[PDB]
């Protein structure tokens, strides 16, 4: 592997919630969509795995 | 010559009731302090946008002056960050000497 | 990179770190090896936020040109500090004009 | 529909069955437990003291 | 600001230090005068008109006394050791508020400043008994050092219970929080544990047996290292006064004084603009207070900065004095505890209770929604 | 630059020590102070409170090794009667 | 027309002097050598008590009040006291702890040069930031000042929640130093 | 009876604490411009007082003019340091 | 200058003056004119248990000035930290490690 | 003489309350902390004593799209 | 410049260079700290929408909001300037009485309730503007409308009554 997958992707949710200046935190909706795709693909892969082999 | 002033039963009862009264007065006070804090925060929130706006024009002013001071001195502007974000200055150019005073 | 600063938070360089983590996760995978190359500039911006070496280098140069430029031009009358402590005050309009040289 | 069904970045784990919760509440874990879980838990529980008793009878302390 | 900061700083430093030094010198006269009333005798009444110069003569007598310090391979321990003991003794005063924020330093971590100065104090006892030329006497200095470190934990664990109610380590904020109630009432056990710890920390009777047995084994060939130094005595009495002021800051009202204005407002209801000031009470009448002569002067004299500051100092002064009395009364009331017995009291009686209260108090604070805010308010 | 100087001092404490096993206890602590001071000064330079937390835990572990070390030194002294190396 | 950039001396919000840091660093170094050269282990520990206070003051003088006070409460208040106890009680003969330091003097030049010449490059720019000279500029913010916390309050905000695993592992380290130190030293019952 | 002569030292201590608090509040009142001093101050309060010196010249000066004077957009202080960072 | 600095100097100066009276005025004379025994383990234990409990109580001070935010989750963790340290105290109470009884 | 807790637990609790009072009531006060956390809040909400909302510690950004304001523009200077 | 609090600051750097002509200009607010806190609730009663647009705008542009949100900042200073002008035109006597009180009370609102109550009645009657602290508890009297203030240095006289908007 030349790619590292974060063991803890929840670091994107880190950050103090106090004394936050406006425009300090970057927009991470595209990060959220990458991790949403990944969850949906594993759900579907497993669904194909245990539904196309249980019939 | 036993006296009730030092008998354990009146003392524990007296000490107990004092602690409950003080614990009633602590409960009410901290509840008032926490509501005074709510009004202090909302008071600073309604002022934060006017105060930040006057700061923001000052940051735009000095940055545009520093960008010009460079173009007139070094012939161009040296890019520090590859991003277009405004980063608040760490170092500044300073006159060689302070005002006489 | 923790996201918590000395005054109740957040940390000054935390935006660059999240911008760097976002770039790596969303452009680099096992399919494309060179996706991480779009991260090279973003990492420099984060190494620069923490250490400020390139900014120091710009200022040392710009400051040397500024001092060598204001050390040779003719000076009419430098404003005293007391004059520049009355700048923008409600009753010292004469001193504000001198500071502004307008 | 709140319009943000997936709102937080989460770790996907390669497992064999569909994920229900990455972090269930304690009350739900007890509620969804099968009666086999109760036998298995009690069987293990008694195994500790019973090992110490059997180990006492055979090699006495 | 109006005038130079350096002048401001000097005026505040002299206004706090010089009146505190004259006070530490009358605590010594007061100990003797109090012990004598309780012991059916008199205190000092001869050096001075009412014995009020007794401290001055005793302090001056020591200064002019020859010192027999060995000075053998030590010219920095003898002449620079004890001097810094007195610097440490006066360092805690700079965080004392004589009014809201009226301190040399208004420090947010004021409590952790005082804990640091207490830990430094242990050295003076350990170094003072280092010059003791005796096997058992040297061990007594270690035993006194072990009494200080143990009762410091009692003092620091107890302060942590006030910080939980206050939310801050600023002595000003700690007192201002007590406008709701003095901390002695809701933290009654914690107060009586703090006072006992403070006497043991000061190494005063009934907790001084460790350093007391030292004078018994000197023999006929040795000497002590406190034969002429007023330094250690000034440090001792200064520590007692500072402990009493801290006890009054944390549990009594600090500088907070019961306010009559609130009591008279509730009772009075017949407000009159003609200056009569009729009262709707059973012992009331028609007062004849002069608007031009008395009420105008009284009202202005109430809000003058000097007057309000004077009654805040007098409040903190009365409460420190009451606690100084309890120190002297305690010394005149009990025998001495053996070192082993005091160590059991600290470690097997007062620390377990404090740790149990360390659990309980935040649990109650959460249960009644009474965690305070930790931002700058009050 | 102060943090590196003190790290040398603790290291040179081991360079110049043939007999003191007490001074090796002292030189370990000087090295811990230099490393904590470095983390603390770099923490103020990056606006990061997590460096202050890591410094705090290094102070706790440092005291705990002092307790574990001086206790072992007491166990050694009870049977040997000297803390001196026969060099 | 006249210089747009103007430099003035602050009057009532003028902070502290950088000089105090060069004084404290020089004092910290001087006492540092005196630790490793002193014949008596007692004097070395006293010079160590001196060093711990110079660093504590440097930290308080640069705004790290709670950690500097914590250093003063723990190192001078408790760690060094345990060092005085053991030292003032063990029988120490000072002649048996003295070694020929001159034999070791050549290796001191060698080790000092090599270690310093490597570690220095490793440090970040901001530790070695201190003729035109750079100055550090600072300005004010309002949204990030609404409810500013002292550092202890900020450490507290994250110490018992986000990074609570460190507290759990340290509590077990202290627990081990308690049980283990008593087991190796005391006579049971 | 009351032994007032033993109470005399206690009055001196109370009077000493009184004169410290009496005089300290007076000099801080004149230091702050014949106005009461500020106490539990934070970054906000300190910056609010710096802006009071921007409008009036005094850290405790006050004015309720909705329009800032000319030159106010230039006197915003940016503190310069040599070592801290 | 700062009040803290002027205060420390003044305390330092007073100490010098009291010292000077002794050197200037008090009389002076030029003439300024080996065993082994085991030490009690108790002395070690007093500093040992102090050092560990002092650190643990120190680690609790940040909780007291951050309780409004720590709240229930913070309370729980701080109680788990209190319970572990208490169990160690019950061990020194159980073995009379302080050797006081 | 002294009882055994496992053999007679209630008679031990009397002996410890009488013979080891500082220790016994430390364990008791300690246990009252977990009791108060499990009883008072349910009783508080039974009688209507609600918890206060958290106070604001960051500027309270409004959720949703911006409101597209009109007024107070450059022409109103 | 950097938001770090300074530790060894001895000098101030000013810059007389003005903003470029292209940026539309604004007149900055000239009220001090204490007048702003007296009118802080009145400004948030009227300027809340504009104050919220500005913060929402800067949020929508991360790292680029000082620029890119100038027009909105100019709208917040004009709206706040309109409230300060109105208090001066109508509530000047009570307004000064309030913030000069806060001047000698550590700028603490609970210390100056009687002055605020009289200023609240003037503003509400002249500008219809009311002070609302959001999310206050419902089982108790609002802290700002309470006859007794525990943490007040001076007792509130019984005849001084809290202003309720409509009674
Ligand atoms: C905690 C528990 C507290 C309560 C229990 C107290 C225990 C001791 C009680 C002793 C007792 O029974 O006293 C009998 C005793 C009667 O004895 P006596 O010989 O018949 O007295 C007749 C004399 O002619 C009396 O001669 P005199 O000239 O002294 O009397 C006039 C006047 C004179 O005194 C004053 O005017 C008071 C102000 C003096 C200011 C001096 C400057 O006395 C008073 O008005 C009494 C005020 C006492 C104030 C004490 C303040 C505290 C001092 C100790 C703590 C510090 O009462 C007193 O003298 C004082 C009573 C106790 C007062 C303190 C409580
Ligand atoms: C924070 C921790 C606070 C712990 C201090 C609690 C007081 C205490 O140790 O009481 C012992 C004290 C000893 O009295 P004893 O009559 O001398 O006991 C003779 C036994 O052989 C005593 O030996 P044992 O091992 O049968 O009983 C000791 C142990 C009971 O230990 C066990 O039975 C199993 C170990 C449970 C550990 C739980 C950790 C979580 O009791 C506890 O430490 C209570 C743990 C739950 C609280 O009373 C109890 O046994 C109380 C038990 C409840
Ligand atoms: C506290 C406020 C009063 C302090 C008075 C200090 C002066 C004083 O007591 O003088 C006593 C002394 C007399 O002390 P004395 O030692 O002679 O007192 C004798 C007392 N009998 C009779 C019981 C033996 O008066 C003076 O000589 C005046 C000196 C003034 C010094 C400057 C003040
Ligand atoms: C002090 C003077 C006033 C109290 C004593 C008054 C008195 O004479 O005693 C009344 C009575 C005892 O009655 P008896 O002994 O019969 O005498 C009757 C005389 N007419 O006394 C009593 O029975 C009542 C005694 C007081 C009861 C209340 C105690 C309140 C305690 C508050 C907290 C104290 C905490 C102390 C902590 C100490 C820790 C070591
Ligand atoms: C030895 C003694 C140690 C005592 C330690 C603490 C014991 C518990 C604390 C004592 C009770 C405190 C109290 O009195 O709370 C009163 C509170 C009333 O709420 P309050 O703040 O007065 O606001 C009312 C506005 N109209 O009422 C409440 O908060 C509701 C209480 C419900 C639960 C009561 C206990 C069960
Ligand atoms: C202002 C404050 C004014 C009041 C205080 C005045 C000073 C009083 C000082 C008294 C100091 C006494 C110390 C006694 C002692 O060393 O402990 C005795 C004893 C604890 O010993 P114990 O473990 O029970 O051993 C068996 C013998 N009793 O028994 C005890 O002492 C334990 C009693 C609990 C201590 C108080 C706890 C808070 C209630
Ligand atoms: C800055 C001013 C002070 C500088 C230092 C001046 C000297 C300070 C030491 C003296 C202060 C009083 O100190 C204390 O006085 C009393 C005298 O009543 C002594 O007490 C002594 O006399 C009484 C007489 O009743 C005996 O019961 C007691 O057994 C005995 O010890 C104490 O031993 C001493 O510790
Ligand atoms: C939680 C605490 C927070 C507040 C901390 C305040 C600390 C103030 C203490 C600084 C003074 C030094 O500490 C103090 O020094 C003197 C002398 O060294 C000691 O006094 C000791 O020596 C004197 C004279 O030699 C003896 O009369 C006395 O019997 C003996 O106790 C005190 O026991 C100690 O309390
Ligand atoms: C701490 C701040 C710096 C120090 C400030 C104060 C410095 C004071 C220095 C001068 C001190 C003079 O003090 C004086 O010294 C001399 C010389 O030792 C003493 O003289 C004594 O010893 C000499 C030794 O030759 C004898 O001959 C002489 O008979 C005897 O009296 C005096 O008794 C003493 O009173
Ligand atoms: C939140 C606070 C919680 C407080 C918890 C209190 C701790 C309870 C458990 C520890 C106490 C029980 O543990 C018990 O300790 C006592 C006192 O040393 C021991 O006591 C016995 O042994 C020691 C050592 O030989 C003797 O000095 C002592 O005279 C003897 O009675 C018991 O052998 C031990 O079983
Ligand atoms: C809640 C339910 C109760 C939980 C326990 C509360 C605290 C009770 C006291 C704890 C110690 O309880 C009691 O302490 C004494 C210490 O003298 C010990 O009692 C025994 O200790 C040792 C044996 O270990 C004997 O040498 C000694 O003669 C005897 O007194 C026991 O350890 C225990 O019987």
Q: Beta strands G135-138 and B91-92: pairing type?
A: antiparallel
Q: Is residue I100 part of a domain?
A: no
Q: What is the CB neighbour count within 10 angstroms for residue I75? A: 20
- Could you give the C-alpha distances from K52 to G14, G45, J63, K60, in angstroms and in order? 36, 60, 10, 12
Query: Are H16 and E22 a contacting pair, CB within 8 Å?
Result: yes
Query: Are E42 and H22 a contacting pair, CB within 8 Å?
Result: no
Indicate which of A7, A10, A12, A15 best probes the interface with C, i.e. most C CBs within 10 Å of its own CB.
A15
Helix (H) or strand (E) holding E150: helix E135-166
Q: Point out the ligand 9 atom lying closest to the alpha carbon of residue I25.
A: 35
Q: In b/e form, how buried is each residue of B9-31, taking b as 16+ CB within 10 angstroms?
A: eeeeeeeeeeeeebbebbbebbb
Taking the C-alpha atoms of residue E167 and residue E178, their distance in angstroms, rounded to an integer, is 12
Query: Are J40 and J33 a contacting pair, CB within 8 Å?
Result: no
Query: Are H64 and K24 a contacting pair, CB within 8 Å?
Result: no
Query: Are F17 and G99 a contacting pair, CB within 8 Å?
Result: yes
DSSP alpha helices (H): ranges in chain G?
19-37, 41-61, 65-71, 80-87, 105-122, 151-159, 164-185
Taking the C-alpha atoms of residue G21 and residue I59, their distance in angstroms, rounded to an integer, is 29
Burial class (CB within 10 angstroms; exposed 0-12, middle 13-18, buried 19+) of G41: buried
DSSP alpha helices (H): ranges in H32-83?
43-55
- Assigned token pair, J41: 């809040």
Angle at C65 between CA B91 and CA B67, to 5 degrees: 55
Domains identified in chain I, total number? 1
Taking the C-alpha atoms of residue E156 and residue I50, their distance in angstroms, rounded to an integer, is 12
Angle at E336 between CA E333 and CA E339, to 5 degrees: 150
Q: Beta strands H78-81 and G5-9: pairing type?
A: unpaired
Taking the C-alpha atoms of residue E211 and residue E204, their distance in angstroms, rounded to an integer, is 10
- Assigned token pair, I70: 């720590």
> Which among B73, B90, B99 has the least Cβ separation from residue C55?
B90
- Could you give the C-alpha distances from G106 to F14, G32, G109, J3, in angstroms and in order? 14, 20, 5, 72
CA of J5 to the centre of ligand 2 (A): 9
Who's near I48: CB < 8 A, 6+ residues apart?
F67, F70, F71, G82, G178, G181, G182
Query: Are E173 and E167 a contacting pair, CB within 8 Å?
Result: yes
Taking the C-alpha atoms of residue E34 and residue G89, their distance in angstroms, rounded to an integer, is 41
Phi, psi angle pair for H78, to nearest 5°: -105, 105
Nearest CA in chain B to H85: B90
Closest of B44, G150, F40, C50 to residue K5, by C-alpha: G150
E strand map for chain K: 11-15, 29-31
Query: Are E336 and J7 a contacting pair, CB within 8 Å?
Result: no
Q: Return the bridge partners of H78, or none.
A: K13
Query: Are I38 and E42 a contacting pair, CB within 8 Å?
Result: no
* Dihedral over Cα of E297, E303, E304, E306: its sign: positive
Q: Return the bridge partners of G8, or none.
A: K12
Query: Are E184 and E252 a contacting pair, CB within 8 Å?
Result: yes
Q: Point out the ligand 5 atom lying closest to the alpha carbon of residue E360.
A: 5
Residue K73 zone, left/alpha/beta (φ > 0; ψ -120 to 50; rest): alpha
Q: Measure CA B37 to chain center.
A: 13
Helix (H) or strand (E) holding G9: strand G5-9
- Assigned token pair, E58: 């005793």
Interface of B with G (CB under 8 A): 41, 44-45, 47-48, 51-52, 55, 58-59, 65, 69, 88-99, 101
Please report the resolution in angstroms.
2.8
Q: Measure CA K125 to chain center.
A: 19
- Assigned token pair, E95: 């965080």
HSE (side-chain half, CA atoms, 13 Å) at K128: 1
Nearest CA in chain G to A22: G143
Taking the C-alpha atoms of residue J47 and residue B96, their distance in angstroms, rounded to an integer, is 71
Closest of C29, C6, E102 to residue G153, by C-alpha: C6
Residue E100 zone, left/alpha/beta (φ > 0; ψ -120 to 50; rest): beta
**E255·H21 Cβ contact <8 A:** yes
Measured from the alpha carbon of residue J24, the closest ligand is 11
Nearest CA in chain B to K11: B98
Phi, psi angle pair for J44, to nearest 5°: -60, -45
Measured from the alpha carbon of residue E71, the closest ligand is 9
> Which among G28, G124, G181 has the least Cβ separation from residue F42?
G124
Task: Report K:16-55 residues touching E (Cβ under 8 A).
Answer: none
In chain K, what are the helix, strand and coil shares in percent, each to the nearest 5? 50, 5, 45
> Which among C86, C90, C100 has the least Cβ separation from residue H63?
C90
Query: Are E82 and E229 a contacting pair, CB within 8 Å?
Result: yes
Taking the C-alpha atoms of residue C41 and residue B82, their distance in angstroms, rounded to an integer, is 6
What CATH number corresponds to the domain at position I41? 1.20.58.1610
> Per the omega criterion (within 30 degrees of 0), is the bond before C10 cis?
yes
CA of B14 to the centre of ligand 4 (A): 9
Helix (H) or strand (E) holding H67: strand H64-67
Domains along chain G with CATH numbers: 18-185 (1.20.120.1200)
In the numeric block, the tokens 């063991």 are attached to A7
In chain H, what are the helix, strand and coil shares in percent, each to the nearest 5? 50, 10, 40
Taking the C-alpha atoms of residue B36 and residue B34, their distance in angstroms, rounded to an integer, is 5
> Per the omega criterion (within 30 degrees of 0), is the bond before E206 cis?
yes
Taking the C-alpha atoms of residue E111 and residue E114, their distance in angstroms, rounded to an integer, is 5
Residue F51 zone, left/alpha/beta (φ > 0; ψ -120 to 50; rest): alpha
DSSP per-residue codes, G101-138: TTTTHHHHHHHHHHHHHHHHHHS-TTTS------EEEE
Taking the C-alpha atoms of residue F54 and residue I61, their distance in angstroms, rounded to an integer, is 16
Indicate which of G125, G130, G154 best probes the interface with C, i.e. most C CBs within 10 Å of its own CB.
G125
Taking the C-alpha atoms of residue G64 and residue F44, their distance in angstroms, rounded to an integer, is 8
Q: Best substitution site from I13, I18, I21, I23 to test ligand 9's pocket, by max atoms within 8 Å of Cβ?
A: I23
Burial class (CB within 10 angstroms; exposed 0-12, middle 13-18, buried 19+) of C9: buried
Domain that holds residue I81: 3-95
Taking the C-alpha atoms of residue E16 and residue E14, their distance in angstroms, rounded to an integer, is 5
- Could you give the C-alpha distances from E332 to E191, E192, E335, G53, in angstroms and in order? 21, 18, 9, 39
Taking the C-alpha atoms of residue E128 and residue E124, their distance in angstroms, rounded to an integer, is 6
- Assigned token pair, F78: 């009870």
Helix (H) or strand (E) holding H66: strand H64-67
Who's near K125: CB < 8 A, 6+ residues apart?
none
Q: Is residue I43 part of a domain?
A: yes
Q: Is residue I101 part of a domain?
A: no
- Assigned token pair, E128: 């003072």
Query: Are G65 and G151 a contacting pair, CB within 8 Å?
Result: yes
- Assigned token pair, K164: 């309720």
Size of interface G-I (CB pairs under 8 A): 119
**C79·G2 Cβ contact <8 A:** yes
Taking the C-alpha atoms of residue E291 and residue E314, their distance in angstroms, rounded to an integer, is 29
Taking the C-alpha atoms of residue E69 and residue E223, their distance in angstroms, rounded to an integer, is 9
Taking the C-alpha atoms of residue F76 and residue E81, their distance in angstroms, rounded to an integer, is 33
Burial class (CB within 10 angstroms; exposed 0-12, middle 13-18, buried 19+) of A11: middle
Q: Measure CA A50 to chain center.
A: 24
Closest of G5, E343, E167, E354 to residue I82, by C-alpha: E354
Query: Are E40 and H16 a contacting pair, CB within 8 Å?
Result: no
Q: Point out the ligand 11 atom lying closest to the alpha carbon of residue J16.
A: 8
From the CA of K4, how many Å to the nearest CA of chain B?
10
Phi, psi angle pair for G165, to nearest 5°: -65, -35
DSSP per-residue codes, K103-130: HTTTT-GGGGHHHHHHHHHHHHHHH---
**H82·G10 Cβ contact <8 A:** no
Q: Return the bridge partners of K12, or none.
A: G8, H79
- This structure was determined by cryo-EM
Q: Is E280 helix (H, G, I), strand (E, B) or coil?
A: coil
Measured from the alpha carbon of residue I97, the closest ligand is 10
Q: Is C28 helix (H, G, I), strand (E, B) or coil?
A: coil
E strand map for chain E: none
Q: Point out the ligand 3 atom lying closest to the alpha carbon of residue E26.
A: 1
From the CA of K157, how many Å to the nearest CA of chain E?
6
Q: What is the CB neighbour count within 10 angstroms for residue A6? A: 14
Q: Is residue I55 part of a domain?
A: yes
- Could you give the C-alpha distances from E170 to C68, E31, E99, J6, in angstroms and in order? 50, 31, 13, 49
What's E349's DSSP letter? I
Closest of B39, H26, E149 to residue K143, by C-alpha: B39
Q: Point out the ligand 7 atom lying closest to the alpha carbon of residue E58.
A: 6
DSSP per-residue codes, I7-41: HHHHHHHHHHHHHHHHHHHS---S-------PPPH
Domains along chain F with CATH numbers: 1-80 (1.10.287.3510)
Who's near D24: CB < 8 A, 6+ residues apart?
D32
The full length of chain F comes to 87
Taking the C-alpha atoms of residue E169 and residue E160, their distance in angstroms, rounded to an integer, is 9
Pocket of ligand 10 (CB under 6 A): E 352, 355-356; G 189; I 86, 90, 93-94, 96, 101; J 23, 26-27, 30
Taking the C-alpha atoms of residue C52 and residue B89, their distance in angstroms, rounded to an integer, is 10
Angle at G55 between CA G50 and CA G60, to 5 degrees: 120
Helix (H) or strand (E) holding E17: helix E5-38
């Amino acid at each position: 592997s030349r790619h590292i997958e974060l063991k803890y992707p929840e670091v994107f949710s880190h950050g103090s919630p106090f004394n936050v200046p406006a425009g300090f935190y970057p927009n991470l909706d595209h990060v959220i969509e990458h991790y949403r795709k990944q969850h949906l693909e594993e759900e579907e892969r497993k669904a194909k795995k245990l539904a196309a082999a249980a019939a | 010559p036993s006296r009730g002033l030092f008998r354990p039963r009146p003392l524990l009862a007296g000490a107990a009731v004092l602690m409950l009264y003080g614990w009633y007065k602590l409960v009410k006070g901290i509840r008032e302090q926490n509501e005074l804090a709510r009004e202090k925060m909302w008071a600073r929130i309604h002022l934060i946008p006017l105060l930040q706006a006057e700061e923001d024009r000052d940051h735009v002013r000095r940055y545009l002056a520093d960008q010009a001071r460079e173009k007139g001195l070094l012939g161009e502007n040296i890019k520090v960050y590859n991003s277009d974000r405004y980063v608040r200055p760490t170092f500044a150019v300073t006159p060689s000497k302070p005002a006489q005073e | 990179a923790s996201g918590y600063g000395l005054n109740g938070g957040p940390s000054r360089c935390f935006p660059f770190w999240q911008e760097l983590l976002a770039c790596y996760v969303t452009n680099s995978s096992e399919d494309n090896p060179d996706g991480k190359n779009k991260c090279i500039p973003v990492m420099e911006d984060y190494y620069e936020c923490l250490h400020h070496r390139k900014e120091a280098a710009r200022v040392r140069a710009l400051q040397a040109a500024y001092r060598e430029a204001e050390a040779k031009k003719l000076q009419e009358n430098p404003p005293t500090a007391g004059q520049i402590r009355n700048l923008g005050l409600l009753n010292k309009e004469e001193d504000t004009k001198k500071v502004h040289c307008a | 529909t709140p319009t943000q069904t997936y709102q937080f970045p989460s770790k996907t784990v390669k497992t064999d069955y569909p994920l229900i919760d990455n972090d269930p509440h304690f009350t739900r874990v007890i509620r969804y437990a099968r009666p086999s879980d109760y036998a298995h838990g009690l069987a293990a529980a008694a195994a500790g003291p019973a090992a110490l008793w059997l180990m006492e009878r055979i090699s006495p302390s | 600001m109006s005038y130079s900061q350096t002048i401001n700083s000097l005026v505040e430093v002299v206004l706090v230090l010089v009146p505190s030094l004259v006070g530490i010198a009358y605590v010594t006269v007061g100990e003797r005068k109090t012990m004598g009333s309780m012991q059916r005798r008199l205190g000092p009444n001869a050096v001075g008109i009412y014995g009020l110069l007794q401290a001055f003569a005793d302090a001056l007598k020591l200064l002019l006394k020859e010192y027999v310090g060995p000075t053998q391979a030590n010219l920095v321990l003898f002449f620079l050791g004890p001097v810094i003991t007195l610097i440490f003794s006066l360092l805690g005063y700079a965080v004392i508020p004589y009014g809201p924020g009226l301190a040399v330093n208004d420090l947010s971590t004021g409590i952790l400043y005082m804990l640091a100065v207490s830990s430094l104090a242990t050295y003076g006892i350990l170094l003072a008994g280092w010059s003791a030329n005796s096997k058992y006497a040297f061990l007594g200095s270690l035993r006194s050092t072990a009494q200080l470190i143990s009762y410091e934990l009692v003092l620091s664990s107890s302060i942590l219970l006030v910080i939980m109610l206050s939310g801050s380590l600023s002595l000003t904020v700690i007192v201002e929080s007590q406008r709701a109630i003095w901390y002695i009432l809701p933290l009654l056990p914690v107060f009586i544990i703090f006072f006992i710890g403070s006497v043991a920390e000061t190494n005063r009777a009934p907790f001084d047996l460790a350093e007391a047995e030292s004078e018994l084994v000197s023999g006929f060939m040795t000497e002590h290292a406190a034969v002429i130094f007023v330094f250690f005595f000034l440090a001792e009495y200064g520590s007692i006064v500072l402990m009493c002021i801290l006890t009054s800051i944390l549990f009594l009202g600090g500088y907070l004084l019961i306010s009559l204005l609130d009591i008279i407002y509730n009772n009075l209801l017949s407000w009159i603009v003609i200056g009569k000031y009729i009262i709707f009470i059973f012992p009331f009448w028609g007062p004849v207070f002069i608007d031009l002569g008395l009420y105008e002067i009284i009202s202005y004299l109430y809000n003058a900065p000097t007057v309000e500051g004077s009654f805040y100092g007098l409040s903190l002064g009365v409460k420190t004095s009451i606690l100084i009395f309890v120190f002297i009364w305690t010394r005149a009331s009990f025998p001495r505890i053996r070192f082993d017995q005091l160590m059991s009291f600290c470690w097997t009686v007062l620390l377990p209770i404090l740790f149990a209260l360390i659990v309980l108090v935040p649990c109650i604070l959460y249960s009644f929604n009474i965690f305070p805010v930790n931002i700058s308010l009050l | 630059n102060i943090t590196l100087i003190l790290f040398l001092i603790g290291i040179l404490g081991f360079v110049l020590n043939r007999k003191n096993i007490i001074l090796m206890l002292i030189s370990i602590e000087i090295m811990l102070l230099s490393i904590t001071f470095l983390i603390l000064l770099s923490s103020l330079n990056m606006d990061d409170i997590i460096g202050q937390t890591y410094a705090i835990y290094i102070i706790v572990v440092a005291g705990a090794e002092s307790a574990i070390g001086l206790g072992i030194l007491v166990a050694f002294y009870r049977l040997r009667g000297s803390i001196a190396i026969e060099y | 027309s006249q210089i747009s950039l103007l430099l003035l001396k602050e009057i009532y919000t003028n902070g502290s002097t950088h000089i105090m840091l060069d004084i404290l660093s020089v004092l910290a170094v001087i006492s540092g050598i005196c630790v490793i050269i002193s014949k008596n282990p007692i004097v070395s520990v006293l010079h160590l008590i001196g060093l711990f206070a110079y660093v504590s003051f440097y930290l308080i003088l640069i705004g790290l009040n709670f950690v500097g006070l914590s250093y003063l409460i723990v190192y001078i208040g408790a760690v060094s006291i345990l060092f005085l106890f053991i030292l003032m009680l063990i029988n120490i003969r000072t002649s048996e702890l003295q070694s020929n330091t001159s034999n070791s003097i050549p290796l001191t030049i060698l080790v000092g040069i090599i270690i310093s010449s490597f570690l220095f490059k490793m440090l970040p720019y901001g530790v070695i930031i201190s003729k035109n000279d750079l100055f550090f500029i600072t300005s004010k913010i309002w949204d990030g000042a609404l409810a500013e916390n002292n550092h202890i309050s900020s450490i507290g905000n994250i110490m018992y929640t986000n990074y609570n695993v460190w507290l759990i592992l340290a509590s077990f380290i202290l627990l081990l130093a308690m049980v283990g130190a008593i087991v190796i030293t005391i006579k049971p019952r | 009876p009351v032994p007032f002569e033993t109470l005399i030292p206690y009055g001196i201590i109370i009077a000493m604490f009184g004169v410290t608090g009496a005089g300290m509040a007076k000099v801080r009142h004149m230091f702050n411009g014949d106005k009461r001093h500020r106490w539990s101050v934070d970054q906000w309060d300190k910056q609010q007082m710096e802006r009071d010196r921007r409008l009036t010249g005094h850290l405790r000066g006050q004015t309720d003019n909705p329009i800032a004077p000319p030159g106010f957009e230039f006197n915003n202080p940016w503190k310069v340091x040599x070592x801290x960072x | 200058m700062s009040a803290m600095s002027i205060y420390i100097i003044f305390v330092s100066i007073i100490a010098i003056l009291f010292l000077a009276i002794d050197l200037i005025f008090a009389p002076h004379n030029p003439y300024k004119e080996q065993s082994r025994s085991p030490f009690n383990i108790s002395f070690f234990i007093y500093g040992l248990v102090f050092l560990l409990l002092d650190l643990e109580i120190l680690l609790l001070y940040p909780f007291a000035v951050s309780e409004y935010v720590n709240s229930a989750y913070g309370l729980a963790a701080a109680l788990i930290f209190i319970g572990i340290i208490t169990i160690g105290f019950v061990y020194e109470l159980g073995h009379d490690a302080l050797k006081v009884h | 003489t002294t009882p055994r807790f496992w053999s007679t637990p209630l008679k031990y609790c009397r002996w410890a309350a009488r013979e080891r009072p500082a220790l016994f009531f430390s364990v008791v006060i300690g246990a009252l902390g977990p009791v108060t956390l499990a009883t008072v809040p349910p009783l508080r909400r039974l009688i209507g004593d609600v918890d206060a909302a958290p106070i604001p510690l960051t500027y309270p950004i409004p959720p949703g799209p911006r409101k597209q304001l009109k007024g107070y523009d450059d022409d109103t200077e | 410049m950097a938001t770090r609090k300074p530790a060894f600051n001895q000098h101030v750097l000013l810059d007389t260079t003005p903003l470029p002509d292209s940026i539309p200009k604004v007149k900055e607010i000239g009220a001090s700290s204490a007048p702003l806190l007296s009118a802080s609730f009145f400004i948030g009663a009227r300027c809340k929408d504009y104050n919220d647009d500005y913060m929402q705008c800067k949020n929508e542009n991360p790292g680029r909001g000082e620029f890119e949100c100038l027009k909105e900042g100019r709208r917040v200073t004009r709206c706040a300037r309109s409230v300060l002008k109105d208090i001066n035109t109508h509530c000047l006597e009570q307004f000064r009485a309030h913030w000069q009180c806060l001047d000698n009370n550590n700028q603490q609102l609970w210390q100056c309730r009687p002055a605020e109550w009289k200023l609240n009645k003037c503003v509400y009657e002249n500008l219809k503007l009311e002070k609302v602290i959001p999310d206050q508890p419902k089982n108790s009297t609002p802290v700002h409308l309470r006859q007794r203030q525990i943490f007040a240095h001076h007792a509130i006289p019984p005849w001084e009554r809290p202003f309720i908007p409509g009674q």
